[PDB]
Amino acid sequence: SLSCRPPMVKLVCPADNLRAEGLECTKTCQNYDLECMSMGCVSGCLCPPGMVRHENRCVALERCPCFHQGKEYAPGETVKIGCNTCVCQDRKWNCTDHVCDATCSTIGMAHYLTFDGLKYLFPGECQYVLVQDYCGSNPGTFRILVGNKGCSHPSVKCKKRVTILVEGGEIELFDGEVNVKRPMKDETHFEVVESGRYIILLLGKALSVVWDRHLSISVVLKQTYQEKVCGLCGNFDGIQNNDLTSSNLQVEEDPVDFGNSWKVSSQCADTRKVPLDSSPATCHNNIMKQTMVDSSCRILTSDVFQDCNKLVDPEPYLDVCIYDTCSCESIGDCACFCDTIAAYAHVCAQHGKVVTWRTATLCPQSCEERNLMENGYECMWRYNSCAPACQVTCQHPEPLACPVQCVEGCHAHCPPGKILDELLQTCVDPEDCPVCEVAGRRFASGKKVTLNPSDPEHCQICHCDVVNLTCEACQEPG
Amino acid sequence: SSCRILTSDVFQDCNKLVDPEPYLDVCIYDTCSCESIGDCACFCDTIAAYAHVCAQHGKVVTWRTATLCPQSCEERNLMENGYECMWRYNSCAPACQV
Amino acid sequence: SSTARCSLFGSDFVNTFDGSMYSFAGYCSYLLAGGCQKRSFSIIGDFQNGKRVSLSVYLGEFFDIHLFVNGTVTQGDQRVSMPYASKGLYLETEAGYYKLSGEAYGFVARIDGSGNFQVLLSDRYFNKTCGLCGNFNIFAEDDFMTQEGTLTSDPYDFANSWALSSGEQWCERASPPSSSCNISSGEMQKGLWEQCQLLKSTSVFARCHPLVDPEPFVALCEKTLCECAGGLECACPALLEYARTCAQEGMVLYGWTDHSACSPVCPAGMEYRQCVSPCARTCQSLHINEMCQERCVDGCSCPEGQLLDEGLCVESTECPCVH
Amino acid sequence: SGKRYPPGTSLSRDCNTCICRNSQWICSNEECPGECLVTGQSHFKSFDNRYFTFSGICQYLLARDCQDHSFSIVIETVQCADDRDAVCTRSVTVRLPGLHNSLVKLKHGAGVAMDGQDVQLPLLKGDLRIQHTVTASVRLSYGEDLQMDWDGRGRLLVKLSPVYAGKTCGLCGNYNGNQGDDFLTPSGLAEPRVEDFGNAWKLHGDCQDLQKQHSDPCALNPRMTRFSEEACAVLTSPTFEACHRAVSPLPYLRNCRYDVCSCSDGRECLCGALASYAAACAGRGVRVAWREPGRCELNCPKGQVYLQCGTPCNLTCRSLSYPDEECNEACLEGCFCPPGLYMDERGDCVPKAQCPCYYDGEIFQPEDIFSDHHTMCYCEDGFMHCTM
Ligand SMILES: *[C@@H]1O[C@H](CO)[C@@H](O)[C@H](O)[C@H]1NC(C)=O
Ligand SMILES: *[C@@H]1O[C@H](CO)[C@@H](O)[C@H](O)[C@H]1NC(C)=O
Ligand SMILES: *[C@@H]1O[C@H](CO)[C@@H](O)[C@H](O)[C@H]1NC(C)=O
Ligand SMILES: *[C@@H]1O[C@H](CO)[C@@H](O)[C@H](O)[C@H]1NC(C)=O
Ligand SMILES: *[C@@H]1O[C@H](CO)[C@@H](O)[C@H](O)[C@H]1NC(C)=O
Ligand SMILES: *[C@@H]1O[C@H](CO)[C@@H](O)[C@H](O)[C@H]1NC(C)=O
Ligand SMILES: [Ca+2]
Ligand SMILES: [Ca+2]
Ligand SMILES: [Ca+2]
Ligand SMILES: [Ca+2]
Ligand SMILES: [Ca+2]
């Protein structure tokens, strides 16, 4: 025997009531809203009706925590998931309803991550519609495309070509640089930020693009659309299983037949339904090599990623690591491996988890060739783990709408009172910028735009090429 | 093809002195066998073994770029909170020093 | 110490890393040792019907060797020759007895001519490897922690938790053998009690007692002296283990087989020495020294001269050449 | 699906129909029933067609009506083999506050127990019907908005009609279409780590919550690594060519290799996972013929015969007693016997000559003349011929 503790009472099965929900139905905080089984009570001791058990302590009140990530949270404690806060107002967190900015991706050579979140496989070779707006019953503002060449089997080959069509423009990029073929009308929203590895690329109030100079395509949209698009990335509705709505307006099941609907040239090659197997071409019947790639792809589950393993499931980004490098014959450039983890590291950073996983025996990424032109070696450049992408320059002095928090890559750092210019690879004082301030108001560094098209009478134009304190005359219509 | 860096425009001085046909046959022998995945060191090491021999005959070479066997040196200028950055990867510096 | 030792000596008997014996007449494969949180390897032992056949080392996922008394070692299903050294696993023969070394992976296995599996294992897996040779801890009573993790009182169902099956054969719960000794008692317990007893009486064994205790060793023999008919040699298996167990502890014994009337089997030309060097100076050998500072190991070896050449002892004069 | 159709055609998904007009399939958006599923060791499926895994050992909730309380289901999980990564289902509990607030319990056989009392099948109470399906699997049916399936060796199913749209809460999710929110703990927030979701629906505090859900238990049993490859490599082999264009096979492959390595006997674990795929291929329309003497053909007794697609309406002898009742059943798979033979209670099947009657429950022999003072009744060949 044992006379149980004061705050709780010994209970006894009655001989009449089958509903002896006693010791077997031991209400804790987890099981309270839940419903419990019971045949009959036992010779145990049990908290009162308006009180429960809590890690060997019969906590008095209904104030016990509101578990997330298997961790305690007192009532009123808050968390940040995505762009939203959320507080357990009682026993149940009630979260806000500000929908966050979704994000496509092209992880490796042949995979695609939709907005709602859906990894799928599509080795293509033709040109394909990554995403657009001209979908059914809408105007058709922007028509981002993607085009691959020799990329059905991932390898050191597969240089991408990206042609994006907005505001009647044609700007496209491949082989490291961007190229304008047709400038768009509203040059005002246009913006390009070559910060670090990336080419961040705004196009409006509700659009943005990113490019790691090698393969990754990560277009970023805002709250504005909410089911106004279609293409490979799907519809951007929150519903995740309707991201296989082909151009002929139905859901498929085999994504290799999905993307074949979205190709541009309707007479080029539709890709071939591969026999599914966990080993690609090289790893097929080469079990040895598979385990050296398997292990080396377990960096995605390593001690340094343990923070991000909790938030972002690595099981998607893992299966790509094993798929590419089997196919890819990495010889001199191990980039068909090194690029897949950075595609995981960046997503870890967007959730606020910086990581430094890159060492000298493993995908080094020097930055020393830039501190070379100058005979003096000031070396202000550095491979900073994850630095901000939207900083201030002689070319872009103002603070820009910043869709990406930070980014890996080589970044400048010199003492303050010196601001960067890209043409002269070194940083420099503010006054050496070709900055423009005409008739007082603060604006950009002399953008090449014709202001005030609205009002003829008020047509008081003031351009500025580099520094000039000039104002042109408007040509009258009469 | 990728082993023909041993016959490239930058090695043209050393191609005259040191026959690359030996060091070539190794480049093709190893990396066939070697399943380079994360570390492309079973390729990057064979050319340095040719570059060093080119240097011993007085022919420095800078063949190492960012898309090709980078060899950063930046982790060392890290312990100090101040970033003096006095360390550098360069061509071929005196093997001996004080 | 910095090492460990398991042994499956004689018929169905076991010796864990911590002085805990029992008997087990298995029926299929069973896990000897290996990690429990994560396995870089796994030593495995196959039993045909109670009696043992094979040692096996599966090195994660991709590589497999299946050595045995048959000696016809194989890699997967293709029978290979011997010796063999792939994947950091030298598969050698030492002192006329077969060896499997994994020093990178921290283990050394071997077998003798009769068939007595042995497993030497580093101190790196202290409180790790949980299996049929038990954990490498200090204690010896708690080293039955099942594949669930459950301290059990039975040394039998434990070994059945650590079973592992194939597509070639799925295996079941083996049964303990029904002992026929229970009726055929007769004189066999009165005359043959001495060979188990001489572990305690004879002076050559009368000095490991501050290091070990023969009380289990004498306990496990008395149940196996009863099935074999007409032989004192039935005691020397349980006795032969006690020699090595004291040797591993840092205190060796000498010449005990001189009067014991049982010597372990070896091929022609050699008989059981004690503490022979592993680096047996053979015929087609390079005369180099003071690299083999390895510890001293038991096993049969050639006479004073009579150098080795291809699994036999041959006189030094008749050393051949090769081309 | 990589093939052409002329205009004006109308193909039909399981959910609804779609028609081709000007290279644009038009489609309806009317809801269609969901299916939570438990099978294998620990492999779940949400109503929103999510897949995941949670190898917890306690009494977990599975589904519940959450704006009103028309029902509530509770699974009970246990370790089920030597490994730690093998947690099969033992028993599920069902609860109906609309009828006595009773408590049904499906047990590890094909048995059932209402309030502790074992019960013979069928069990026509007012609303809920419980009857065998192939005489090897129970099928609860409460109302017309609820079904179930056998929890003997752990292949629990459900069928919820769209009247429960978005108004349930449990491991199986909201039943709202959205595949993402389904990791929403009872405290009202979407969790990313599954190890937090499943342990958030446990019923007993003493149960240990786990910390890591392992994905490759074949490491702890390296012997099965080979066999798990060639075995479920038939899942992608063109034997199942017909329903790669019906449902994604990649998880039904992923859930094999976790079972064949983990469970005590990989023979049936294999051949209870392949059928998990065929059963969903058939739920959309595609039947497959994947049985062989090697690939686990079941052994129908000598009275019965194997059959692929058949009619469980004209099989049981109870059918001739109640022929008027509707049998709006599908073309199922199992052990039947030829049409001249109908099923007897004792495992053999028999012609309709000695097929008894089940009048008022009472099992009358093939010739039993039978009468009170005022009625007059007899059993001829299965049917009960009453007069007055
Ligand atoms: C959450 O609930 C609290 C308490 O009812 C309320 O004050 C608050 O406005 C709610 N917030 C959201 C985002 O719904
Ligand atoms: C570089 O990274 C370090 C370490 O995260 C940080 O302390 C520092 O502010 C960064 N500097 C720049 C210029 O981004
Ligand atoms: C500024 O613009 C005027 C035109 O009004 C032009 O003549 C002058 O060269 C420009 N100056 C600079 C520095 O660009
Ligand atoms: C590279 O090193 C060489 C040899 O020490 C030296 O002459 C040269 O100035 C260095 N160049 C740079 C860019 O550091
Ligand atoms: C044993 O070895 C012999 C000779 O190589 C071989 O014929 C036989 O099949 C082997 N048996 C086993 C058990 O492997
Ligand atoms: C051995 O491991 C167990 C389980 O992790 C732990 O509880 C115990 O403290 C460890 N003991 C030693 C001696 O390290
Ligand atoms: Ca969608
Ligand atoms: Ca922040
Ligand atoms: Ca010189
Ligand atoms: Ca022990
Ligand atoms: Ca849902």
Residue numbers in the entry:
A (entry chain C): 764 to 1241
B (entry chain D): 1058 to 1155
C (entry chain B): 30 to 352
D (entry chain A): 353 to 740
Task: Show the paper's wording.
Von Willebrand factor (VWF) assembly begins in the endoplasmic reticulum of endothelial cells and megakaryocytes where VWF is synthesized as a precursor with multiple domains. The polypeptide including the propeptide and mature VWF chain (proVWF) subsequently forms “tail-to-tail” homodimers through their C-terminal cystine knot (CK) domains. These proVWF dimers are then transported to the Golgi where they assemble into large multimers ‘head-to-head’ through interchain disulfide bonds between D3 domains of two proVWF dimers. Therefore, the disulfide linkages and the cysteines involved in the VWF D′D3 dimer interface remain to be confirmed with the discrepancy mainly on Cys1097 and Cys1099. Here we identified the disulfide linkages from the D′D3 dimer interface through chemical digestion and mass spectrometry and solved the cryo-electron microscopy (cryo-EM) structure of VWF tubules with each repeating unit containing one D′D3 dimer and one D1D2 dimer.
In order to gain further structural information of the D′D3 dimer interface, we purified D′D3 dimers complexed with D1D2 derived from the expression medium of HEK293 cells transfected with expression plasmid of D1D2D′D3-wt or D1D2D′D3-R1136M-E1143M. The tubule-like oligomers of these complexes were analyzed by single-particle cryo-EM. This yielded an electron density map covering two repeating units for D′D3-R1136M-E1143M dimer complexed with D1D2 at 3.3 Å resolution and an electron density map covering one repeating unit for D′D3-wt dimer complexed with D1D2 at 3.4 Å resolution respectively. As the overall configuration of the refined D′D3-wt complex is essentially the same as that of the D′D3-R1136M-E1143M mutant, the structure of the mutant was selected for presentation due to its slightly better resolution. The shape of the repeating unit largely resembles that of MUC2 where a D′D3 dimer is docked in the central hole of the donut-shaped D1D2 dimer8. The electron density near the center covering the D′D3 dimer is unambiguous and a clear density covering the disulfide bonds near the dimeric interface can be observed. The structure showed that D′D3 retained the overall conformation seen in the crystal structure of D′D3 monomer (rmsd of 1.7 Å) but with local conformational rearrangements near the dimeric interface. The connecting loop linking two helices in the D′D3 monomer restrained by the Cys1091–Cys1097 disulfide is anchored in a hydrophobic pocket formed by Phe1100, Met1055, and Val1056 through Ile1094, but in the dimer, it is more flexible with the intramolecular Cys1091–Cys1099 bond and flips over to dock in the same hydrophobic surface pocket of the other D′D3 molecule in a domain swapping-like fashion. This brings two Cys1097 residues in proximity and the subsequent formation of an intermolecular disulfide bond.
